[model samples]
Target: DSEMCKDYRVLPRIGYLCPKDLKPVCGDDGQTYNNPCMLCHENLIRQTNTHIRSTGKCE
Candidate 1:
């Protein structure tokens, strides 16, 4: 119930490259990811299509 994956570099290990930034992002799935990278990681691991609903925590 969301958009398809946008950026995947062909390896799940790529998620490890995500920086530990404090910039939070709210996913359409209603979860607050620490950052877009983590959000992508979530999508990758969960095999779900969740997009950035906003640039901050969810209300």
Candidate 2:
């Protein structure tokens, strides 16, 4: 559901920042992003396919 994940999302490449030190997301590149912005940097800045595992400290 696009709306389900669009709580704070305003763009395609970037989603609603899950907040700081709160709803953190885990990157597939083996990095625990403090927030969505930190994780999106890889994609928007570095241009790497930095993917989020549905926002969780998951595998």
Candidate 3:
């Protein structure tokens, strides 16, 4: 019953790999970390923090 009643979710946007060049797209903020790091580090620290907090891993 637990397995049958499990809920699943999905991300709203498609995921992509961060390009090595790390060029900023037009109209995007000048934050290289957001653009470059986010690619490979999708759901990086910020997202991980949320999960950690939810699981009582963070104080």
Error of 3 at 36 (Å): 4.0
Candidate 3: RMSD to truth:
14.3
Q: How does each model score on TM-score?
A: 0.68, 0.45, 0.22
Per-residue lDDT tens digits for candidate 2, residues 1-59, read 12334333346665444445655778777766666665654455565657776676655
At residue 8, give the lDDT of candidate 2. Answer: 30
Question: Per model, how many backbone clashes are there?
Answer: 0, 2, 0
Quote the positional error of residue 2 for candidate 1 in Å: 9.7
**What is residue 11's positional error in candidate 3, in angstroms?**
20
Q: Taking the tens digit of each residue's C-alpha lDDT, what string does model 3 give over 2-45?
A: 12113423354843334465433221121223243332243332
Task: Please write out the lDDT profile of model 1 over residues 1-59, one tens digit for every residue.
Answer: 13334544645454345666777888887788877777776776787767888888877
Ten residues in a row with the worst lDDT in model 1?
1-10
Report the Cα lDDT for residue 52, model 3: 12
Candidate 3 is scored at a TM of 0.22
Candidate 2: residue 15 lDDT (0-100):
41
Residue 32 accuracy (lDDT) in model 2 = 67
* lDDT sort, best first: 1, 2, 3
Comparing 1 with 3 on TM-score, the higher-scoring candidate is 1
On a 0 to 100 scale, what is the lDDT of residue 45 in model 1? 75
